[PDB]
Design a protein around this ligand. Structure first.
Ligand SMILES: NS(=O)(=O)c1cc2c(cc1Cl)N[C@H]([C@H]1C[C@H]3C=C[C@@H]1C3)NS2(=O)=O
Ligand SMILES: NS(=O)(=O)c1cc2c(cc1Cl)N[C@H]([C@H]1C[C@H]3C=C[C@@H]1C3)NS2(=O)=O
Ligand SMILES: NS(=O)(=O)c1cc2c(cc1Cl)N[C@H]([C@H]1C[C@H]3C=C[C@@H]1C3)NS2(=O)=O
Ligand SMILES: NS(=O)(=O)c1cc2c(cc1Cl)N[C@H]([C@H]1C[C@H]3C=C[C@@H]1C3)NS2(=O)=O
Ligand SMILES: N[C@@H](CCC(=O)O)C(=O)O
Ligand SMILES: N[C@@H](CCC(=O)O)C(=O)O
Ligand SMILES: N[C@@H](CCC(=O)O)C(=O)O
Ligand SMILES: N[C@@H](CCC(=O)O)C(=O)O
Lengths: 260, 270, 270, 260
């Protein structure tokens, strides 16, 4: 029995190869998440098929309709049996799906065009001259919405009541917006994504300040599934054996097509 | 029903208060784990009583006897119900108990005595004989050891990386023993060895000791691996899900990093 | 019974909200004084409705008619119950109304246009033609004036100090008039006069405007006197003691300091 | 009828004249408060007699006794009719006596022996290497005891549970302790007192940082007394005519027996 895997087109997690016209099956994908899924399948011993979620959504809740979208919605409604993807472990998501142990630590970071005048997020919130936003239907926007710390509340009130729409559909779109804003737009995204972008050409973006908080990516399964314990054990074994270190080094530092 | 909270005596996690002679109950202890458990109880309502393992071991399965010792050992057989303590999540431990999401990350670091400032225009420079782990393994003049019945020793035992394999090969055949019974004993060995000993401990305790007086020790290199501390709970128990959700709520709310900052950097004596 | 709170339209005390074309009631205004009124109502359980004086005057006495105008004027004749506004405590006002203890201090300062950088080793320096009130009184080229129907104008009118007496004699016989109907109008005069006008206003408004865009003005010298802002209440009213005790409680707690910090130093730029 | 005035021996408010063994009445006292009392009496029109409170205390509340000591106790129990002295205006004191409009502003200040390692009070609270304390039966210890801001609570807990007693009987004794502690002891006192001490010989002490808050000195009067309104109007008139400024200049910025 094959296992349907839902992923999202994200670099360096899932890339759609470069010469994929003649490729079929799982061989048309590449990235950290593809290798992680291969190792998970090898450890557990099942045959899997990689699939891209129809909507490029990580997972959220719509306007008071109690319907999950994206990869979380794909898992909840039985469309997929596992989600190997950069899916943040959050309280709201844990109540509907099971998360394994985190395989990669991360945090919220600020990305701007290439001493910065803002640096820390407090100066970013205090100064309204520059604009900042997040990725829609994600986990950073949900972090800012449900936050209670005053600086996060004022940041969220800025972003929600902003003209025009400060949110972006895809992190690539937000990166392009930051690059084309001539240093007038700031991006709030995951630290790993910011590092990967800043270590790649044309190297016109960079990360400022520290990390607002710390989270992690987990491998998600439908609630009450029979694969949660095997994937948890496989993730623990891979972390102990240094496979995750090797994969991160391969997909984040080994290429490094930038001078730094 | 009053459940017990088994915990280890480690700083700044749990330690006896200055006036701990006359108080009783949970008021005797202070640190990060005590108010972490207080927050856990505040979120999900349950009464708890702090307990300390007699042997003072974090947990490891003994060889040829198949008897788990330490905190994990007494948690498996039922003499405890939950362990709010710096217990490292490992595959060997997960096979017998249920862990929660890590409430704080950590790594394995190297602790050495801080050398004196180099005299040579009129600038002072800090030069250390060990800068990573590979050179520490290569050299011989500086000895290094781990903590007995800990996660670091277990990690080095089954490691397949060449550097860590060679480190374990050196450590097992060492005379006199380089292993210590407590992290306090390892820190004392580092401070009294005049640079002839290096301690391998978790990065959190390493930084905490580095920030406190007499601050004669420094940490070299990066983190050997990336791990975390999870709240332990016996397999099949009903407390796993409430504690997991409480940890997630605390992480999302900002209590966790505030506690870490106020118990790791606010008292930056050195 | 719903009482009315009279207040002047002054920044950053009370200003109309950006989206004030659809809101109503207390939600139409924001600033320092609305927060002060909210804290006063939180201390003692009374319901309030903000009102704005029609003439927009702080309060004075019309000459040869012995009548009060402005906020104090309409407070004396029973058309308001409490004046939570930046109203200066003066002897002439104390004879008709009751003033609580000051909730923040202030002083009369001088405001002039900020001069450009002096190019002439390669260090820029700021040189101002006015450095105190004495030289401002002595010089003639730069004109100066106070706010109409305000506390500073009255202070200059009955002053016996030689410098202030000379300044008042110059002001009363100045053609064209140097007095202004609003603080904003005076700041506009300073900005548009190209350095040929100086504005005498309270240090709080001076600093607030100096710390806001386009910030082409600066404060010179020191405070000509020490004064305070008191909550005004009609004579023989039952609210005087509660509001006085509330101001004391807020000062002891520190709400006044945080309000000052978050409305004077957190909203500044340049 | 003469009016009994209660004062406290404090410089530069009430001093003892150099040649006073042969002087009777109010002629043996000098200072800011003596001049203030003289001007108040001149404005209102009564004759007054200055007296020193039997216990050199400003006034506080005993432990579970509901008894006022010091000048406040001298006012409540009918021993005195008015108190022209550096008495701070506080909520707990306004419930037993009436305070006029403040005639001099002030605030908490930190005093050290002459790099400024102590710097702001947050560094004072974070560091247990250096010691500090307040005056007993005053308005600063009461401010620290009833405070709710975290730094003030931790300073208060440190001072109350300290060995030996960090508090001092008289502010002069506290200044002497600071001068004789070789920089090992800090003093918390009023800004005006700190400035007067730092501008006088041997001027081996100095003020560091900014005022922690802002209070004022008021001329106290027993509750429901007929003198409240006259003294309030007199203080207002004196402030508007610059008499208070002249007196402060005379007693603070006119002698200056130190290089400054
Ligand atoms: N260096 S990293 O971000 O790629 C990274 C981060 C992490 C890893 C492994 C790696 Cl390689 N494993 C840990 C897991 C292992 C065991 C201990 C904590 C969890 C359970 N989570 S983590 O601390 O989020
Ligand atoms: N900055 S820190 O080490 O105190 C720290 C470390 C961690 C925190 C929270 C903090 Cl404050 N939460 C995460 C948890 C939150 C959710 C995502 C990963 C786990 C589940 N684990 S963590 O990555 O080990
Ligand atoms: N720092 S400030 O100008 O915002 C400020 C100024 C003042 C405050 C409180 C603050 Cl926060 N309280 C005092 C009051 C408290 C008691 C002593 C004097 C009056 C009654 N008045 S004040 O000296 O005018
Ligand atoms: N410069 S000073 O400390 O000598 C000083 C301080 C103050 C003075 C007068 C002087 Cl000279 N008067 C004011 C009072 C006058 C009227 C306005 C505020 C109160 C009522 N209080 S104050 O702001 O505490
Ligand atoms: N890592 C995030 C991406 C969305 C975001 O950037 O907020 C997630 O999985 O939800
Ligand atoms: N935290 C480790 C012990 C500390 C160490 O090994 O340095 C454990 O749970 O085993
Ligand atoms: N606060 C003053 C008005 C401001 C000014 O005169 O500058 C008053 O109540 O009269
Ligand atoms: N000015 C203070 C002195 C007491 C102290 O310094 O604590 C008072 O009148 O209470």
């Amino acid at each position: 029995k094959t296992v349907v895997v839902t992923t999202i087109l994200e670099s360096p997690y899932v890339m759609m190869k470069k010469n994929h016209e003649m490729l079929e099956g799982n061989e048309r994908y590449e990235g950290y998440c593809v290798d992680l899924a291969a190792e998970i399948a090898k450890h557990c011993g099942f045959k899997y098929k990689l699939t891209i979620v129809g909507d490029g959504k990580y997972g959220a809740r719509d306007a008071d309709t109690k319907i999950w979208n994206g990869m979380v919605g794909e898992l909840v409604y039985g469309k997929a049996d596992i989600a190997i993807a950069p899916l943040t472990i959050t309280l709201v998501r844990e109540e509907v799906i099971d998360f394994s142990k985190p395989f990669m630590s991360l945090g919220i970071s600020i990305m701007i065009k290439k001493v910065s005048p803002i640096e820390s997020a407090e100066d970013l919130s205090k100064q309204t001259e520059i604009a900042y936003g997040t990725l829609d239907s994600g986990s950073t926007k949900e972090f800012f919405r449900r936050s209670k710390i005053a600086v996060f509340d004022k940041m969220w009130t800025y972003m929600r009541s902003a003209e025009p729409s400060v949110f972006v559909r895809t992190t690539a779109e937000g990166v392009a917006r930051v690059r084309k804003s001539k240093g007038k737009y700031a991006y709030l995204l995951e630290s790993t994504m910011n590092e990967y972008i800043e270590q790649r050409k044309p190297c016109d973006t960079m990360k400022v300040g520290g990390n607002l908080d710390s989270k992690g990516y987990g491998i998600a399964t439908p609630k009450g599934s029979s694969l949660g314990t095997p994937v948890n054990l496989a993730v623990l074994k891979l972390s102990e054996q240094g496979v995750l270190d090797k994969l991160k080094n391969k997909w984040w530092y080994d290429k490094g097509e930038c001078g730094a």
